[PDB]
Design an enzyme around this catalytic site. Structure first.
Site, short mmCIF file in Angstrom:
data_model
loop_
_atom_site.label_atom_id
_atom_site.label_comp_id
_atom_site.label_asym_id
_atom_site.label_seq_id
_atom_site.Cartn_x
_atom_site.Cartn_y
_atom_site.Cartn_z
N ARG A 25 -16.77 -17.06 -27.84
CA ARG A 25 -16.60 -17.44 -29.22
C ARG A 25 -17.74 -16.69 -30.07
O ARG A 25 -17.28 -16.19 -31.20
CB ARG A 25 -17.20 -18.88 -29.37
CG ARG A 25 -17.26 -19.45 -30.74
CD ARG A 25 -17.97 -20.69 -30.85
NE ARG A 25 -17.36 -21.63 -30.02
CZ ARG A 25 -16.45 -22.63 -29.99
NH1 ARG A 25 -15.79 -22.35 -31.35
NH2 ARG A 25 -15.87 -23.45 -29.41
N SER B 129 -16.06 -24.23 -34.72
CA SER B 129 -16.47 -25.34 -33.80
C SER B 129 -16.02 -26.46 -34.73
O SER B 129 -15.47 -26.39 -35.72
CB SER B 129 -17.94 -25.38 -33.63
OG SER B 129 -18.50 -24.19 -33.05
N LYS C 50 -6.64 -34.30 -33.96
CA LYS C 50 -6.26 -33.13 -34.74
C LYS C 50 -4.96 -33.65 -35.77
O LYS C 50 -4.02 -34.18 -35.03
CB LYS C 50 -5.77 -31.86 -34.22
CG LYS C 50 -6.96 -31.34 -33.10
CD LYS C 50 -6.55 -30.12 -32.53
CE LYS C 50 -7.41 -29.81 -31.23
NZ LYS C 50 -6.96 -28.47 -30.51
N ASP D 62 0.80 -1.08 -0.06
CA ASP D 62 -0.12 -0.08 0.07
C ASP D 62 0.88 1.25 0.13
O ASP D 62 0.64 2.37 -0.84
CB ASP D 62 -0.93 0.02 1.17
CG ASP D 62 -2.02 -0.89 1.07
OD1 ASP D 62 -2.05 -1.66 0.07
OD2 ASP D 62 -2.99 -0.81 2.02
N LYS E 80 -11.23 -33.55 -24.68
CA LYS E 80 -12.03 -32.51 -24.86
C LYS E 80 -13.05 -32.12 -23.47
O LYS E 80 -13.36 -32.84 -22.86
CB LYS E 80 -13.22 -33.09 -25.85
CG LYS E 80 -14.21 -32.11 -26.03
CD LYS E 80 -15.28 -32.48 -27.12
CE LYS E 80 -16.07 -31.49 -27.77
NZ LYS E 80 -16.92 -30.49 -26.83
N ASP F 71 0.58 4.23 -2.98
CA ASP F 71 0.41 5.65 -2.55
C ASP F 71 1.34 6.66 -3.19
O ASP F 71 1.16 7.70 -3.49
CB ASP F 71 0.52 5.78 -0.79
CG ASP F 71 -0.64 4.83 -0.31
OD1 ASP F 71 -1.93 4.66 -0.83
OD2 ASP F 71 -0.40 4.13 0.91
N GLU G 104 3.72 1.75 -1.45
CA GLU G 104 4.16 1.64 -2.78
C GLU G 104 3.13 2.21 -3.83
O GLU G 104 3.41 3.22 -4.39
CB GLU G 104 4.55 0.45 -3.37
CG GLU G 104 5.92 -0.27 -2.46
CD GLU G 104 6.40 -1.63 -3.17
OE1 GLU G 104 5.47 -2.57 -2.66
OE2 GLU G 104 6.93 -1.70 -4.04
N1 LIG Z 1 -9.28 -29.77 -26.54
C1 LIG Z 1 -10.01 -29.07 -27.66
N2 LIG Z 1 -9.60 -28.76 -28.50
C2 LIG Z 1 -10.14 -27.97 -29.51
N3 LIG Z 1 -11.61 -27.58 -29.14
C3 LIG Z 1 -11.99 -28.05 -28.01
C4 LIG Z 1 -11.48 -28.60 -27.14
N4 LIG Z 1 -12.21 -28.62 -25.95
C5 LIG Z 1 -13.20 -28.23 -26.34
N5 LIG Z 1 -13.17 -27.60 -27.44
C6 LIG Z 1 -14.19 -26.72 -28.17
O1 LIG Z 1 -15.46 -27.64 -27.84
C7 LIG Z 1 -16.18 -27.46 -28.85
C8 LIG Z 1 -16.70 -29.15 -29.16
O2 LIG Z 1 -18.09 -29.02 -29.32
P1 LIG Z 1 -18.94 -29.83 -28.27
O3 LIG Z 1 -19.39 -31.21 -28.83
O4 LIG Z 1 -20.33 -29.42 -27.60
O5 LIG Z 1 -18.11 -30.59 -27.15
C9 LIG Z 1 -15.23 -27.19 -30.23
O6 LIG Z 1 -15.93 -26.56 -30.97
C10 LIG Z 1 -14.11 -26.71 -29.64
O7 LIG Z 1 -13.75 -25.60 -30.41
N1 LIG Z 2 -1.40 -2.40 -2.70
C1 LIG Z 2 -2.17 -1.75 -3.76
O1 LIG Z 2 -1.87 -2.51 -4.89
C2 LIG Z 2 -3.15 -0.89 -3.62
C3 LIG Z 2 -3.86 -0.59 -4.70
C4 LIG Z 2 -4.97 0.52 -4.74
C5 LIG Z 2 -5.33 0.86 -3.48
N2 LIG Z 2 -4.73 0.52 -2.45
C6 LIG Z 2 -5.01 0.85 -0.89
O2 LIG Z 2 -6.24 1.15 -0.97
C7 LIG Z 2 -6.56 2.32 -0.24
C8 LIG Z 2 -7.20 3.57 -0.95
O3 LIG Z 2 -8.12 3.81 -0.25
P1 LIG Z 2 -8.24 5.09 0.86
O4 LIG Z 2 -7.00 5.94 0.31
O5 LIG Z 2 -9.69 5.59 0.44
O6 LIG Z 2 -7.97 3.90 1.99
C9 LIG Z 2 -5.19 2.50 0.34
O7 LIG Z 2 -4.71 1.67 1.37
C10 LIG Z 2 -4.22 2.36 -0.82
O8 LIG Z 2 -3.12 2.00 -0.49
C11 LIG Z 2 -3.49 -0.38 -2.50
#
Ligand SMILES: Nc1ncnc2c1ncn2[C@@H]1O[C@H](COP(=O)(O)O)[C@@H](O)[C@H]1O
Ligand SMILES: NC(=O)c1ccc[n+]([C@@H]2O[C@H](COP(=O)(O)O)[C@@H](O)[C@H]2O)c1
Length: 321
Positions: free
Chosen positions: A137, A84, A293, A34, A116, A38, A36
């Site tokens: 898709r 598909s 395939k 936090d 699959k 800020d 960093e």
């Molecule tokens: N291992 C896989 N490789 C390629 N396509 C997959 C695979 N698994 C799922 N799919 C997608 O699942 C669909 C198959 O149709 P379904 O008969 O409803 O299972 C295909 O259209 C694919 O593009």
């Molecule tokens: N560590 C992070 O990545 C991150 C990111 C966004 C907000 N915050 C925190 O969220 C808080 C902002 O809200 P307030 O400043 O209203 O408390 C602060 O504590 C700030 O440091 C932290």
């Protein structure tokens, strides 16, 4: 500082701040202290003091406390069409598909066999190693934008991991499946009932409903999983085969299944179908078949696709209980 550098510094600091706002408020999983955060926000407000043209209603300085994170499912285009799969339900139908394949490309084709998953298809786009879009898709050309929901999925990395073996592509569209483990489906239904809501009838409905949330903080509270199983558009990545593309996906940090095998011909395909027919109940998520395939990308192109489906793939679906 010069105006180009001012705009550069603003965009970078706005994006870093917005990312921590998201991780803290939506995911409830900050990755910096936090203290960093800020300092970051002070620097951003300082910089907007000098240059008030930079302060918009869109600025993270104006969207504090978790405001401005809503999913609206707006249509978004896939980079490459997301079809598909044709299905086979019998030994004969699968042999027929296998025969048509051989007659066109002969023994040069080998067959990747994947499990699959009965889940919800999701397309992820990474640009320069960062997640920029996730979508359902839809109709195959166009899906719904659920980027914020997907960014809450633990298996979906925000950034791809560099490695010299496999350079991060300039663009990577990767397809995969979202789903629940059986034990987490039941636990989520128990939780829902405790709050007066209806349970889901199956884990597929439960995953779809949990992903498609206007408020992504709901999605973040649920144990959605994902497994990548396919490539769309890629730039800066030319893998010769699907199984080699999985090696790169693993290297980049993307989740892949451990149950994929490479078979030489139809006899090897039939053994995997028979095996998973007997053992799919042991997998901790739902498997409704085996996707076969052609592994070689060059042969995938030669054989092409129809309007609705690739010709180089078939889904063997098991008969329902
Ligand atoms: N291992 C896989 N490789 C390629 N396509 C997959 C695979 N698994 C799922 N799919 C997608 O699942 C669909 C198959 O149709 P379904 O008969 O409803 O299972 C295909 O259209 C694919 O593009
Ligand atoms: N560590 C992070 O990545 C991150 C990111 C966004 C907000 N915050 C925190 O969220 C808080 C902002 O809200 P307030 O400043 O209203 O408390 C602060 O504590 C700030 O440091 C932290």
């Amino acid at each position: 500082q010069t105006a180009p550098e001012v705009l550069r510094q603003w965009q970078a600091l706005a994006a870093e701040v917005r990312e921590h706002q998201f991780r803290y408020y939506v995911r409830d999983a900050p990755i910096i202290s936090d203290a960093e955060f800020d300092e970051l926000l002070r620097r951003l407000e300082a910089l907007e003091e000098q240059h008030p043209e930079l302060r918009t209603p869109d600025s993270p300085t104006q969207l504090v406390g978790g405001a401005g994170f809503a999913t609206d499912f707006e249509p978004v285009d896939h980079l490459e069409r997301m079809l598909s799969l044709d299905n086979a339900f019998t030994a004969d139908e699968l042999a027929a598909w296998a025969g048509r394949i051989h007659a066109e490309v002969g023994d040069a084709a080998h067959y990747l066999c994947e499990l699959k998953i009965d889940g919800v298809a999701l397309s992820l786009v990474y640009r320069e190693g960062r997640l920029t879009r996730a979508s359902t898709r839809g109709d195959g050309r166009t899906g719904e934008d659920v980027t914020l929901n997907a960014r809450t999925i633990a298996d979906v990395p925000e950034r791809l991991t560099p490695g010299d073996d496999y350079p991060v592509p300039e663009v990577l569209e990767v397809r995969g499946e979202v789903f629940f483990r059986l034990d987490d489906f039941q636990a989520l239904n128990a939780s829902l009932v405790e709050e007066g809501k209806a349970p889901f009838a199956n884990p597929r409905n439960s995953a779809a409903g949990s992903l498609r949330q206007k408020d992504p903080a709901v999605t973040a509270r649920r144990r959605l999983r994902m497994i990548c199983h396919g490539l769309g558009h890629v730039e800066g990545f030319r893998p010769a085969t699907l199984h080699q593309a999985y090696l790169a996906l693993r290297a980049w940090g993307l989740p892949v299944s451990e149950h994929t095998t490479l078979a030489t011909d139809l006899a090897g395909v039939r053994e995997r179908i028979d095996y998973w027919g007997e053992h799919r109940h042991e997998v901790d998520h739902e498997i409704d078949g085996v996707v076969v395939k052609v592994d070689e990308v060059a042969l995938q192109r030669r054989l092409g696709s129809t309007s609705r489906a690739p010709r180089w793939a078939i889904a063997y679906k098991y008969p329902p209980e």
